Amino acid sequence: HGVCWIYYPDGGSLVGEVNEDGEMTGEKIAYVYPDERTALYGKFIDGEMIEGKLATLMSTEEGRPHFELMPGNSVYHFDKSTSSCISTNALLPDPYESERVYVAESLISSAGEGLFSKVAVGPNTVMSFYNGVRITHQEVDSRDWALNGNTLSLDEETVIDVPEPYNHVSKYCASLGHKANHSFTPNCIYDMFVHPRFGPIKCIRTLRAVEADEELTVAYGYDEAPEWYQVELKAFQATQQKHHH
Amino acid sequence: HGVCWIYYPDGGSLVGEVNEDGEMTGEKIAYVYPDERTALYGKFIDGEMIEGKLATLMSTEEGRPHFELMPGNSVYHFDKSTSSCISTNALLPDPYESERVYVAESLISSAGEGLFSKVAVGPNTVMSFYNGVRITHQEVDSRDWALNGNTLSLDEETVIDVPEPYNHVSKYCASLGHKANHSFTPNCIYDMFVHPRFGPIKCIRTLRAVEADEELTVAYGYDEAPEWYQVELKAFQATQQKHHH
Numbered sequence: 001h002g003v004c005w006i007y008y009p010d011g012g013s014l015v016g017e018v019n020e021d022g023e024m025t026g027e028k029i030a031y032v033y034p035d036e037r038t039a040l041y042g043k044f045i046d047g048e049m050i051e052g053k054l055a056t057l058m059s060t061e062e063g064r065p066h067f068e069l070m071p072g073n074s075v076y077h078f079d080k081s082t083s084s085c086i087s088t089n090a091l092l093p094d095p096y097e098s099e100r101v102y103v104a105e106s107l108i109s110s111a112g113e114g115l116f117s118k119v120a121v122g123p124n125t126v127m128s129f130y131n132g133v134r135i136t137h138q139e140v141d142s143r144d145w146a147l148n149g150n151t152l153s154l155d156e157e158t159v160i161d162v163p164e165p166y167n168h169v170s171k172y173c174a175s176l177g178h179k180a181n182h183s184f185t186p187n188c189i190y191d192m193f194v195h196p197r198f199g200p201i202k203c204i205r206t207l208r209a210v211e212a213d214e215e216l217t218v219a220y221g222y223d224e225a226p227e228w229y230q231v232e233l234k235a236f237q238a239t240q241q242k243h244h245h
Numbered sequence: 246h247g248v249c250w251i252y253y254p255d256g257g258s259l260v261g262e263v264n265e266d267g268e269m270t271g272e273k274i275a276y277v278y279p280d281e282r283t284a285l286y287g288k289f290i291d292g293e294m295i296e297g298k299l300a301t302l303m304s305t306e307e308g309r310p311h312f313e314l315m316p317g318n319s320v321y322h323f324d325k326s327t328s329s330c331i332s333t334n335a336l337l338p339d340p341y342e343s344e345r346v347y348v349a350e351s352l353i354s355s356a357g358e359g360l361f362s363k364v365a366v367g368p369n370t371v372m373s374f375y376n377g378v379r380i381t382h383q384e385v386d387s388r389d390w391a392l393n394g395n396t397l398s399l400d401e402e403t404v405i406d407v408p409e410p411y412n413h414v415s416k417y418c419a420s421l422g423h424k425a426n427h428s429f430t431p432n433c434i435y436d437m438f439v440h441p442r443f444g445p446i447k448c449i450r451t452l453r454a455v456e457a458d459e460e461l462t463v464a465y466g467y468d469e470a471p472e473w474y475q476v477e478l479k480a481f482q483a484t485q486q487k488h489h490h
């Protein structure tokens with residue numbers, strides 16, 4: 001039997017025997033996260049996750065992976081957001097993300113909640129996912145800008161948003177990327193991600209080695225900006241040491 | 246007459262009328278730096294700079310550039326380093342770099358000289374060039390590691406080095422990239438660059454908007470490291486604020 005591995009730029013992969021028609025369809029197909037260990041294994045149709053059970057990639061022999069199911073009954077399916085629906089299981093967390101990050105009070109004064117590393121990781125490590133409702137740039141630009149705290153550009157056409165009430169973990173915790181605060185000295189970046197549950201979204205990826213319990217921060221893309229950002233920029237600029245002539 | 250623009254990934258370009266044979270050969274060819282304004286204009290042979298005089302790209306009309314020579318008699322040619330020769334005019338500075346950076350005492354204690362921004366720039370701006378002698382990785386790895394303070398990897402085969410006495414500006418100042426110190430909170434990165442004088446080298450490019458007289462720093466690529474780096478890493482790690490459980 002002939003196995004295909006399709007790796008995404010982000011390091012994740014779809015792996016399985018293609019059927020007679022060349023489609024990734026069957027009962028023993030898997031998505032493997034970028035750690036090359038955490039997997040969602042089970043029923044897929046044309047590469048789409050129907051019933052992916054939490055599993056571990058234990059070994060591979062001549063391209064053929066061996067998966068072992070994790071204890072419990074964690075199971076996932078393709079559940080792309082719409083403009084109006086964020087998730088059909090908003091409180092079901094992502095298992096890869098849950099091992100790597102947690103939400104707590106931000107270390108930045110008055111900045112609400114932030115996102116923190118649960119464990120030590122090296123540079124270029126995917127930590128968290130930024131999923132949300134899919135809206136147009138035109139819709140974001142034309143509406144009240146007070147509504148645009150969590151609007152992250154996906155591409156030239158699409159913005160990913162986490163609107164009220166989903167910006168609270170008691171209502172939405174399937175992904176947690178929207179909890180990372182801004183810093184001008186960030187330790188993470190936003191990057192593209194192809195997720196088996198969320199579809200094409202963005203992720204948070206480290207820029208350096210990060211120790212456990214550090215806050216994860218990203219430099220936000222303003223280039224008008226919110227007042228808190230204007231204030232922090234002026235303060236950052238004043239803080240920088242300079243050569244004196 | 247038919248003009249060709251060849252842009253490099255770094256934003257610089259070669260521009261000129263191709264000759265009957267399709268080669269970038271003639272007396273009116275130019276290299277234009279990534280600012281799309283600073284240019285080296287004159288005699289090129291098959292895309293190679295023979296006599297490039299300092300000039301400004303003033304305008305373009307239907308692909309045809311108009312250059313105006315700068316005052317003075319600044320002129321440059323292709324002068325790729327060897328394993329043993331860094332430059333045939335080591336003290337002739339790069340004109341683009343000279344407008345953007347200067348060397349002074351580093352703001353990092355006991356870290357010698359550093360590299361500083363001369364002017365305010367936005368993110369993703371090329372500031373400085375990292376040229377030097379071209380040696381193999383095998384040569385760098387096998388020799389005394391005390392000789393490897395300025396060794397920057399160019400590719401899988403080649404390392405760029407600025408050995409003694411060329412690490413002093415009184416002996417070498419054609420490029421200044423080797424003056425940028427390390428930081429775990431850098432404001433620049435190393436990037437690839439195709440230079441008309443130096444050939445394929447690396448550059449220093451900003452990661453954020455940088456104000457005038459800020460020190461330019463990059464996160465060095467260790468991933469054994471020098472003792473100063475081990476010491477600074479432990480100190481950086483201890484300095485980071487953490488969430489407390």
Ligand SMILES: N#Cc1cccc(C[C@@H](NS(=O)(=O)c2cc(F)c3c(c2)CCNC3)C(=O)N2CCCC2)c1
Pocket residue numbers: 137140141148149150151152153159219220221222223
């Ligand atoms: N312009 C703009 C703009 C509008 C809203 C939000 C932002 C910040 C956004 N910058 S963005 O590049 O993703 C962006 C987000 C957007 F919603 C839009 C634009 C750009 C372009 C203009 N149209 C809307 C960012 O980095 N964020 C917000 C969530 C946490 C981090 C920028």
Ligand SMILES: N#Cc1cccc(C[C@@H](NS(=O)(=O)c2cc(F)c3c(c2)CCNC3)C(=O)N2CCCC2)c1
Pocket residue numbers: 382385386393394395396397398404464465466467468
């Ligand atoms: N390993 C290693 C190594 C050896 C020497 C220097 C460095 C640091 C180098 N890191 S490197 O990725 O460019 C590098 C530079 C190297 F010379 C070598 C390697 C890697 C791989 C091993 N072979 C040699 C760097 O970022 N520098 C030095 C000049 C100022 C910034 C790393």
Ligand SMILES: C[S@@+](CC[C@H](N)C(=O)[O-])C[C@H]1O[C@@H](n2cnc3c(N)ncnc32)[C@H](O)[C@@H]1O
Pocket residue numbers: 106108110111112113114149150167177178179180181182183228232
């Ligand atoms: C993507 S959310 C980040 C998580 C948010 N702090 C929370 O509690 O849900 C972006 C919002 O966080 C706040 N924020 C992010 N970075 C900040 C910073 N550096 N300083 C102050 N507020 C910040 C602003 O309210 C902004 O609209």
Ligand SMILES: C[S@@+](CC[C@H](N)C(=O)[O-])C[C@H]1O[C@@H](n2cnc3c(N)ncnc32)[C@H](O)[C@@H]1O
Pocket residue numbers: 351353355356357358359394395412422423424425426427428473477
């Ligand atoms: C590429 S050179 C940088 C310029 C150098 N400081 C000079 O004066 O020429 C690298 C050398 O600078 C020093 N250096 C760079 N960053 C440092 C740092 N953060 N702390 C201490 N020394 C540093 C080390 O001596 C290292 O070998």
